[PDB]
Amino acid sequence: RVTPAQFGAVGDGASHPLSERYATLAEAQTVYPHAVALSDEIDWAALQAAVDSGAPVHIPSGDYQINRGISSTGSLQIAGDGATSIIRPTAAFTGTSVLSCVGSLVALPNISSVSAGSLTIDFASTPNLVAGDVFIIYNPTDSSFSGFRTSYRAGEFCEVRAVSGNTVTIRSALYAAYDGATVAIYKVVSGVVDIASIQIVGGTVPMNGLLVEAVVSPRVDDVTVTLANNAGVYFARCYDAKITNSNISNIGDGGDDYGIIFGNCHDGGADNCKVYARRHAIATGGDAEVGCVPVRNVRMRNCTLRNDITSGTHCADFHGNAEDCSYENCTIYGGATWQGKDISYRHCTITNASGGWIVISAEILGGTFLLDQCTLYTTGDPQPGNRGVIDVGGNSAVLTTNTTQPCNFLIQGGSLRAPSLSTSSYLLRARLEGSTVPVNIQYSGQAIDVGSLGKVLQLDITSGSTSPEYLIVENLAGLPSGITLASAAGGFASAPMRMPVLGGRVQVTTATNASSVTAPVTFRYIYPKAPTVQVTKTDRSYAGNRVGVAIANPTSASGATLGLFTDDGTNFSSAVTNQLNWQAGIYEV
Amino acid sequence: RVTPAQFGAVGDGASHPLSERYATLAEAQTVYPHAVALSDEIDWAALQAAVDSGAPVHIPSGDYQINRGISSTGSLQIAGDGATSIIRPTAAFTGTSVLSCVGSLVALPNISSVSAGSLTIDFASTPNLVAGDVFIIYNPTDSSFSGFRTSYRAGEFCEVRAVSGNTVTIRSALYAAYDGATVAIYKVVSGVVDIASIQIVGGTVPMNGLLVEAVVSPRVDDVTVTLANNAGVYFARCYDAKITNSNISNIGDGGDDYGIIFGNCHDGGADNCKVYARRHAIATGGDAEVGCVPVRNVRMRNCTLRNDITSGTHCADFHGNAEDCSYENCTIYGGATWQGKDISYRHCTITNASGGWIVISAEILGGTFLLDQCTLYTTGDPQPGNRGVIDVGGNSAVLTTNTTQPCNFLIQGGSLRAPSLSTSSYLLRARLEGSTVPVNIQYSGQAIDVGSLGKVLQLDITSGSTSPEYLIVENLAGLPSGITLASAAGGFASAPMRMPVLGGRVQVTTATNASSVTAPVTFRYIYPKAPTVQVTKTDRSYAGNRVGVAIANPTSASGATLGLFTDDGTNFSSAVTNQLNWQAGIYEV
Amino acid sequence: GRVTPAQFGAVGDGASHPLSERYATLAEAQTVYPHAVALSDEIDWAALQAAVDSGAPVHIPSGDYQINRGISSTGSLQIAGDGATSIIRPTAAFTGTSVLSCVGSLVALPNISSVSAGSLTIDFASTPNLVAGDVFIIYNPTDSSFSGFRTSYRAGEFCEVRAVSGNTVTIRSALYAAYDGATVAIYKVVSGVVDIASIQIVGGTVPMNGLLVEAVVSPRVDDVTVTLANNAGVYFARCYDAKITNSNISNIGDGGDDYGIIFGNCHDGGADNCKVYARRHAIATGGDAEVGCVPVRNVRMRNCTLRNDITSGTHCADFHGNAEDCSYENCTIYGGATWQGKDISYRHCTITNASGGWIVISAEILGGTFLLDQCTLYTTGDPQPGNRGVIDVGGNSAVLTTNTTQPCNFLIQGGSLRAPSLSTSSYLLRARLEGSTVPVNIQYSGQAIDVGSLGKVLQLDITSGSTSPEYLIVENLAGLPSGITLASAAGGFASAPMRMPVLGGRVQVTTATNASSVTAPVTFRYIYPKAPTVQVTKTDRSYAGNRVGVAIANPTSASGATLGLFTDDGTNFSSAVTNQLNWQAGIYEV
Ligand SMILES: [Ca+2]
Ligand SMILES: [Ca+2]
Ligand SMILES: [Ca+2]
Ligand SMILES: [Ca+2]
Ligand code: NA
Ligand code: NA
Ligand code: NA
Ligand code: NA
Ligand code: NA
Ligand code: NA
Ligand code: NA
Ligand code: NA
Ligand code: NA
Ligand code: NA
Ligand code: NA
Ligand code: NA
Ligand code: NA
Ligand code: NA
């Protein structure tokens, strides 16, 4: 509705300080009240004034030179003509973000204590809320959500359903319980944020290309952002923030170096974005400011993500304050991570990080962690660095005294290709370093393509202990002969186990000078302990004078000696074939 | 192209009746031929005149007060500057919908009878159709698609491939057969419908925020709609209706209370929308008007949905006239439903409705119903309401004489967390109330996280009968000891079954004063009938004078007495240990 | 956009207006439109072309613009309209290859040292004109350097620059393949902004393409409607991260290749939320034989509904054999789909049959992994009379040949497959060797099947060549009727490590006091590829008078077994009493 040209923008790609047009600061401020100095860029002055007008701003193709950030409280509405509508910080730029909009957390009355899964909140006095309003429940106590980091504090975003007196009902169930004496409540007050069809060429100075903070349903669509600093796009304390159809590339400056990060956000996500950043193309986390609650129901879909493989870290990120978030239908070059609680990767294609691993874990609070029908590729071998291809604390402190809820690690279907492992390598490692909770494993349905391999599961205990409900390896295709199904220490060894069935038909021939004949079997896979073995004689009835009793003696985790013995010890009177049909498995759960 | 300001709009948020500007109605009608009274809103008159010009309408930021719907026939093109372009019914509003566009159903010739799966339609005379045209085959006979409601009539939308004389080929196979003597055919005649980047604040009076009816490929994008009445967005009899990137919030007025509903629609769906509504955030169904055919190939993807949990109903809806529709990659707070035919939930996260159940059924015609790799949560327990966590007629008439096709209920992978069930609760219930078709269950691969639990399956018959092709429980993680695998009545009990394997190794020591030694085993899970049991002796050969024959006697659904007996009844001559390796399962299909 | 066709003199009223209506001479017309060719050219075309030529973004108001020549550009093309009422319409007099087109450039870079697959470092022979974010193509001009199935399936790929230090260029993702430095030419992709949105092209019968975008980084097509009766509604050629979204594309075809949207030699990007029809392939991938014709990689089709002409006899959803690491996800596909190339997946798709009755067909299999991941499949027909599986891998065509050079894994995981009209001779999946010598592995796992009659799950044949598979697995299937064959397996398939489902039951036998044995026959519900591993145990009786009896099976075969209870020493049983013979059978080799 307004343009920067209407407020005097030039936008020709060259510098135009206000001094080119105004002899005095007072004269410049008569036109641009918030100009700071005559050396400020006319393009910046014009863009900021247009934003300040309160009308949606349309930015025609041009190359706008700015020395300060374009910022707003409340609302920010900017739409360009596409990638040719360029906002470009100059070498003289100062400020935290190229574009920014910041809403408000406004104190609400305190509340009564409330249980997890409730949809009713009792305020101490009349709350200024109506249906559709958004508020944050916030616990200022350090580590109130997770002990892994100080800043992982508890709370969540609620959406008002109805209000009756001091009672406020909400539109979806609470993720967590709150003691009323420990939380402060804030109404999220913000205007309309919609940023579309522009290109930010941020350079090396600003920390963020775009910052949107404490806003309900901001929208970023069809943008291009390049930067060499901390974050291409940073959503902080936003509810239903969406960024869609955008290309974000952050070369980094050697800091946290994020492409798109959702800090203390709830709902929304990224859809159909192509993203590169040095460390984490997409990430979740937050800060330590008021309202720094966990990241929940944030969904990354249909993106392609790349990072700098030499950074050594995972490309797709969640930090340990995430709960109930996922990457879905994403192509992820350079690895992914399980952190926090209740995290899923669904139908993603994921390649390895530099260490050779594909999925790595950290800061596991507990809950369920899932690789759902993913396609996994590694060109390396993480075993020399003590990690699994899917790693849970192999060489790091991940399952600790800060892991306070039972954990379920679920690998369902999909495929895993890893041509360059050794006979020492393992597909999944979990190592306890202080936790005392059940750690359950379901490794199920996946098709595996390897050269050499040592083991499917490697389950270790450095400190702490576990009593799992289950330890399951099942329906795997592509396992080569000789591998170990699960090395399991301590409480993993005594866990209720299900292990794959092996078996076959072994011919034995009786001898007329003996009451028995035996034959050795070496299992194609090594079990964690002696499996449950069946043996049955087929394809012969009387071997002369006796049927014979089929047994196995001994049996072990690695094999068994099959035998056919006359019950009473009489020698067989004929020398003839018999088929010993054997099988082995473990079926405790 | 045109703006309401050009036609005299004010849009400042206050009321401006025509009387402010025109002394008589005649005077006003010179400018606005459609004006009804001098009390009409200038903003309404202006917006309607803008629509009536036939040019695309751009609505600049503004708050436009209207007392009547903005409506059109055939085409409607409205685009604003985003959420600050607000259309607002006043207290005096009269009309059914805030914005609406209605296309036409134009008679085509009758047709010859045609079979399901055909791509060739024979018209009785020359049809006015060319490639790309869309028509509806419509059976006006009540319940011609489904007997569950009279308005579930048969027919479908067809897209013309080629026309040769009176023969019309179509671009995809027919879903159903039609007797030519029973159907009337209608060409869908409509123009361009495109509604984008506006906000409708509908209030309590209009039944619909947006209504689009009988239109080919209408588009709704980047809109925000709030309402407290029947439907935020209602697509009726549309082909390839698509709504994208929109936020829809219907507080409801205590009726059907839908967010987005697709009535009698084919193709299209909802993508990347955040939706709240009191009863069903998204739904499908229809009315009883001409062309009220089944809802097909409508796909809801990448949405977050919420409802009022106190409504007691499911948040994500399909009615019984749905065929071949799905929700995929959606976050669903407040439950989902199987109804109609061939319905799936894929990679969704779903929480419980107030009853404690998560997926509920109604109006099952038959076909295949799938929960594919979904993450399911319930904080409650549906068993006291006689419902499973996944429920098929537990407490309602769902599998009845109106269920006319074989049913397959499939649960594949994913997870289910339900910490608060009792030892009486069951994960899935199916109860017959009059149906006679096969009802097949595949409960396969899911990771389960419970405290107490009674049963995996509960399969009951109040009336009717069934001869299932299969009844399968397999590859489940997380089942606690003592649960029942399936309680199965009548034809469920005699169905070909597959039930999980349990087994173990039990040490027994022979005694020199007996020919046998036994040991009791109680299975971890209770089978629906005595399972198929194997026992083999290992890790010992002769026990003095005899090997011993390993048997089980008795066996039952809940356990077995393992035994080692000398074949000839001679007492064992030595007291030595032996391992009885036992296992059980059911392997009929 | 900045400029409009009106500003350059357009009419856009739907009727023809040759330049001769306004200008008496060609010279006078060219004063206004320098690139007009003749006074008979359309004013709408001259105006639209001039608007594009201005270099400003072009906004096209509602109107119906008549053009007799393509609207084209080099480097950049920015066009946005008011939606489907902004119509660009070739006239009967149209001449040109494409209605709308933008072509970027491939600019030679220095040569590189040999590099391994999986590398992220490239060494240039001399200083390269590259910075971070730049895109280049490694190209091998040698015919069939990626796949032997076609000449034009040449090797190479798109790389995105991470950093440059001296002659060393690091890249943002690992190379898919290895390259001999002496065999490749390297090219920078130089292009500007391409953005086409919110217009309708009514192409007609003349143009080969509705929209062509060639050699461009991140072109964007959004909210467009395209109809045509020729070769390709939308053709992306040698593009990196081409995205078409929210569009309706319909190609009636002219009897040629007849594509809706085709990605030729493209890397990254894909199609999202599109409704597409084309006579042959609604969406396809492939390419041409021009410089830079590299494999199609990381192209993702998502959230689309696709239809084709079923009487064409071909699959609706296409990849050609030069595809690697591509997929369809969350698509409704009427008229079948295909596995070709390497590492291809369909995920959460609903797919119906092509005319032959099959649903997924293969061709030009290089090797790697081919996945149907939780798909819903439906056929109204039966492909067996045409010698093809419902899921087919060379049943009646040359698919697994000397050009299949890498181990193949065919995976069917979960989902459902309904096929009510098969016969007792039909098979769900067929794979047939016609010259390949690599392992061919099958995982058929977890699917719920709904059939009337059926012959077999797998039909594994060898016409020529040979195979030593790592695995052959059938497991966790629901809905198989009695009497089917699990796997017909010939040659090396027959000797592969197999996993086959368990069958079992409890059979009552009563001893006789005048014999030392009692037997009972069992016929398995499914026929195994070879004699299965069988267990038998006696339950629910201890001594039958004087003896327990030893439970065995004799004989056993692929189709059944004779269960037996025999006193060990051949003494007659002394009592006639019941016993339960608990039997089971399966194959458990992998
Ligand atoms: Ca390594
Ligand atoms: Ca309940
Ligand atoms: Ca035995
Ligand atoms: Ca056929
Ligand atoms: Na000042
Ligand atoms: Na100054
Ligand atoms: Na503002
Ligand atoms: Na609301
Ligand atoms: Na911290
Ligand atoms: Na012999
Ligand atoms: Na009147
Ligand atoms: Na068409
Ligand atoms: Na002993
Ligand atoms: Na001329
Ligand atoms: Na860059
Ligand atoms: Na060729
Ligand atoms: Na072929
Ligand atoms: Na008896």
mmCIF file of C-alpha atoms and ligand atoms in Angstrom, chain A residues 130-133 159-161 171, chain B residues 225-227 248-251 276, ligand 8:
data_model
loop_
_atom_site.group_PDB
_atom_site.id
_atom_site.type_symbol
_atom_site.label_atom_id
_atom_site.label_comp_id
_atom_site.label_asym_id
_atom_site.label_seq_id
_atom_site.Cartn_x
_atom_site.Cartn_y
_atom_site.Cartn_z
ATOM 1 C CA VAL A 130 -11.076 -13.693 25.081
ATOM 2 C CA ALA A 131 -11.521 -16.686 22.755
ATOM 3 C CA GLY A 132 -8.583 -16.971 20.299
ATOM 4 C CA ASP A 133 -6.130 -15.100 22.537
ATOM 5 C CA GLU A 159 -4.918 -20.754 23.014
ATOM 6 C CA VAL A 160 -8.085 -19.496 24.708
ATOM 7 C CA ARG A 161 -11.292 -21.422 24.061
ATOM 8 C CA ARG A 171 -8.149 -25.333 22.835
ATOM 9 C CA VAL B 225 -11.344 -16.498 9.036
ATOM 10 C CA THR B 226 -13.038 -16.306 12.417
ATOM 11 C CA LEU B 227 -16.698 -17.044 13.045
ATOM 12 C CA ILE B 248 -9.581 -20.846 10.323
ATOM 13 C CA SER B 249 -11.201 -20.517 13.722
ATOM 14 C CA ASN B 250 -14.860 -21.296 14.302
ATOM 15 C CA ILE B 251 -16.054 -20.867 17.875
ATOM 16 C CA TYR B 276 -9.850 -24.664 15.318
HETATM 17 NA NA NA D 8 -11.040 -17.385 17.576
#
